[PDB]
């Protein structure tokens, strides 16, 4: 059996230990009931975390056999950069994009923490991810891809667990009954999950479509919708070498994690990258979220502007189509499946490899920015190529006339189709007024 | 022969008469050389045109046999609304979109003015569209689809024409030599083409990638990048009935043209919808443009937000894929070809028909706005459906466990593929650190 | 609760009564245990059924409250024709195709029999479809789409049912213990499911990949692989009007069911349309089947040959892409979902509507046939259009030279990309020998 | 200027010297008029060529400065194998496929012969490919990608050439007037172009759709449609290692050219792989051809059968979609463009790399064959996985019930859409009879 519904007494069980009430109470309870819990805390460069080292120590205090801090920043940023290179984003509204930051975080922690558990002889993961979300499924696959012998204990399937730690208040009472003066965090009107690529806000009041970003206190940027917050316009340069982001404002970095942290600071000052999406969950039901990803947004804008100046139309269209499809697979927890790897590897090799260049932007408030300059030794755009100024052209007016004439047979075929569609009722006429009129409900 | 290189003396020739120097000098010249020109001016609701009635009168004064004002506003707005319903936009940069406003305008005028010419027994169109642009090709097909017997005279293929009206100065001198005290318009640092769906700015200084929107004086909106321009935040509501935009700020309109003019006013106050694109022309070479489309942008944002709250994932993905493909066909001048009609009709019938609802936005500067509310009697998003509050769920925790178990065989297959790809060199390992590592250049 | 695990005593329960041992024993058992079963038999024009009227009478004899014969032939053939018009087939191997005949049959019976049950005040369906197949899921959705109040009783979830009717032998013993001298059918080396569109053979010895079509006794055609079976070559004509198949061998029919029965006879004489597929089930695991669909294959060949002579390339490619996607949705039981309806309606309206014409074939053995003639008043293929004979061409040699020159800028860009890819290691060189060499494992 | 319309007197000009009347007369004429022609003959393993060495000697006799035999077999077969691995075939009719053998041949010779010319200081190619075909465009790009300084002389643009060598008879008379007792080949009712991957037959009587394969004398196989030709059934095995075809009938080869020649012999004995296609040319007008490719067909069937037993559904669908798109690019002469390389490299790396296995077939006549066995150490199909025999399953009946329940919310949404579409007129009803009825012309 892969899924365990009862606490495996006397056995080693791993817990992805965040340090919050849920994992603190669960770890203490698992130790108290006879299991041997091992805690693993992922360093994800969370914007609202200032003391990762204190977390494993809290796990030991609550009963962990051993507690480790697993650094996942390097891997997280590497996958985030791959996602930018592939345009692996599928939830967009009016062009505004969610950068799939939670899905990227899960691909990294679901594999890395289970690998750390395996290394320690821990083959059971006590994962509390809930039954209505996407993470329960993402963690299930990533964990099993990493350890074929993995078993997953879902505490909420254990009646003994539910009877004692059924909610926040029960858990708080439990900690106190166990001798720990636990202090709960201040309640918010929504729930937040974050990593150094982005933050997601959902649930509670954000379940209502008449709530908006205004109820959120951003953790990676400023409240740009508040007129009293001063945000001076700022010029910023983003430079890539073979698809890899290497410099911001003319400066290079010791590693990609430092680069991403600076991208976040720059975008954050403006509130760049925030969006509000209604999305389709893996289970085919909709949820709503508010998102932040300042650095990812900054890199995305510059990367796409260079793409438009370097690649041909067929290639750009394959980037958009394959990237969206890849974004959906990423969201589904299938980032390492063959159908995703084949799209990601393709886009990195043939599209991203040629993205060498620099884009200059002026950032103002929120998503309001302007492109100021675009340069690249690989540009196929050239000011002289299609200019009507001066002269000297690769093709002549007579050449274009020949190209137009080559369209004649197909134009005749299309006209004949218009007559055919009018005869079969799909068009009112192939003309009337001149413009063909399609016969459907939207034709007023 | 379809294309004529010599002025057809003694024959009727139609001219799409804009009223500018080029069409004024060409019409006068064609009359002077023995042809019988007929002028057709399209009323396109251009933002920078205040006196359409004066244009046909100027055509008569310069030599037109007859001059007509053909109203194309109703048809233009109908096609613009269809484009919104279909998401028929393919040039996007970092999510910012060009609304294909010139391609829509050409589909309407290329067919309507040629139909008006045919009605008057005019079977030759003297069209000066240039040899390096997209319009020469769009007009060629739309014209021939409308009139199988159409011939197109390209003045720039006529050496006599070039010898006399080779440039702006030659044309100006010609008007004066012909007895007309012609007054040229003030020169700008770029060229503009517009209609009531949008304005495009290109050429001259905009050919350089280090020029930006700041050199443009917007004609449909304000200079939002200028801090001295005051733009108060504004709440706006956009309501649709079966995919059709029917109310703005709770008010309905006498017709769709009035609706679009109000959408433009609202978005215009904020500079909503402006973008800067490097695009691929039909001839496979790149050009650069600055675009305005305030009303189209406002409707697009609201339409997509409703789409995300109403349709399932497969359907939304077909809207994005088919809409982009349709946008490319529209740009190519193939809006009435079978491959475009089949996508447009499909999206209107099955996607747009269910878009009944209202979206509330707060518009600030440029593209910076926030979504404040989303309502629809057709929403499939419901706050109660996936909430962890209260209780009562359509599926249980045990149900989700079963769904996860059904993934086991495919998860095993994927793990086996990871081992297989590591063996064949595509992955460093199926793990190392835990995260599979793809073997390509972007892997640092 | 939608799914019921216990027999609903005293309530009306509908059974899709095939007349075999499984449904005979289940109906008798349900009556014996206190339920009130209503039997519904679908007339699907099964090739191996000679007495549909006897079935409802057998249901009454075994305990049915009422038993009805629901004719589904007209609807089945209508959906089969729609599938041909849309090329809604996704499981192909080396070009050989499975015509999704079981998925079409389920869409029709899942909706029609539940509608018949609802009409009779029966809101519970006792459906034995098994837990490992595709049908359990197809019937579940089609049933619930038709009756929102439907509950589905799965007998195999009832321990009392399993204890008594656990297998074929137990069921046979049960019938006898209940007073019925039941005579089981002769056992075969595989299982068969059929309707007038096609027959599927799977399970038992067909689970082994070293078994082949040779172990199957075809029920819609002859054993064409057996040299001793004589099959004279046969000329056949298939004619369509606006996408609808109307004549075979110059003869018309009283209705589409008669047409399809004749198509099956013609193809059947040759064994046309048989295939062997390894396919992916809805649950993401593979199964193997042997298939027959003589009439569907005959119509498919003629329809596609006309498509190639009538439609442009973009349109043909949309037919292939959208048709495959639609085939997958059909297989998933999503034939009536928005994402499927939008593809099916599109293809019927814009692709099928223009398919008017006739194709002549010579059928020999199995899939070996030749196309002998293709005619259509809508052909865009014309022998004179691209012939090098005589003369008179719509475009001239000079015109083609101009069209070639228009490719120059993009050719330069591609060459530059080849140099760029060689520099970044994706190509060995942009040349070596002359042919660019891609750097991957398949490059020997 | 890239294209030359006049013979470049005193300059070196390369000719792709086939040895037929056209290239013999053209080379002699070019020498006679003052140019310095260099002949290049591609060894393409043509099925109807028995003496390649005699060709360069004939070129010298007619006036070549130097004449070389360039072996292109290794490169041709490498690209043919890549095409099989990628399913790069887009012209299919009823599942029957054209294997893009001419497009593959042109990609290889267009680059290799121009590279050979460049190596010899020859920067002008006298290429007679005609103005109405696809090759003029394929050769133009492949040549210019290989040599940026290439100029192409089209003899048919030279009036002096046309005046003297306007047709077959004029050319024959020319050879004789120049002192060569030239003997023309026997005339056929169609034209043929071939290489070791396949042969194409077109033009003359094949321009008429009432002509058929029966007028063709196959050059790579037998006349399988002729009952008097005896073709015994034959068992054949095809084995792949990591996507590469390595053994036929249990035997390996010294190189891939020998392997392909044996594949051709095996398929040829049966006439496997012949098809008749109406296709869309690059210029958007249709042509008709008869095709042969026995070896390619044999490898394609085995490769796809293994694909279906090894890869998941998303991956197989990407293979079909990306492969067709790649086939169209190959046909267009864009095999080395970024948009093609990105699809080809992707499919080779992630799809083909896992195709290790062996398929056994029984070949009979033409396309009539049966699959007899399928084996692979990489199969994800397993007879035990979904069998209802014995027991022991990875998922239980209860697990499937949970998976079904997870569909409930989306099923409700779809039902609601059916009601919505009936209300807006797209469906007659969400039911009537039970089956939803789409409101379009094909609904009888």
Swiss-Prot record, chains A, B, C, D:
Chief subcellular location: cytoplasm
Entry's Gene Ontology BP terms: argininosuccinate metabolic process; L-arginine biosynthetic process; urea cycle
Localization: Cytoplasm
Pfam families recorded: Arginosuc_syn_C, Arginosuc_synth
One GO CC term on file: cytosol
Binding site for L-citrulline: 98, 134, 138, 191, 200, 202, 279
Single GO MF annotation: argininosuccinate synthase activity
List of residues binding L-aspartate: 130, 134-135
Enzyme class: ligase
Keywords from the UniProt entry: Amino-acid biosynthesis, Arginine biosynthesis, ATP-binding, Cytoplasm, Ligase, Nucleotide-binding
Assigned EC number: 6.3.4.5
Ligand binding (ATP): 16-24, 42, 128, 130, 135, 193
Record keyword Lyase present: no
InterPro entries according to UniProt: Arg_succ_synth_type2_subfam, Arginosuc_syn_C, Arginosuc_syn_N, Arginosuc_synth, Arginosuc_synth_CS, Arginosuc_synth_type_1_subfam, AS_cat/multimer_dom_body, AS_multimer_C_tail
Domain notes: The monomer is composed of two major structural domains: a nucleotide-binding domain and a catalytic/multimerization domain. Binding of ATP results in a large rigid body conformational change of the nucleotide binding domain.
Family in the record: Belongs to the argininosuccinate synthase family. Type 2 subfamily.
Complex and partners: Homotetramer.
This protein's name: Argininosuccinate synthase
Species per Swiss-Prot/TrEMBL record: Escherichia coli (strain K12)
Gene symbol of the encoding locus: argG
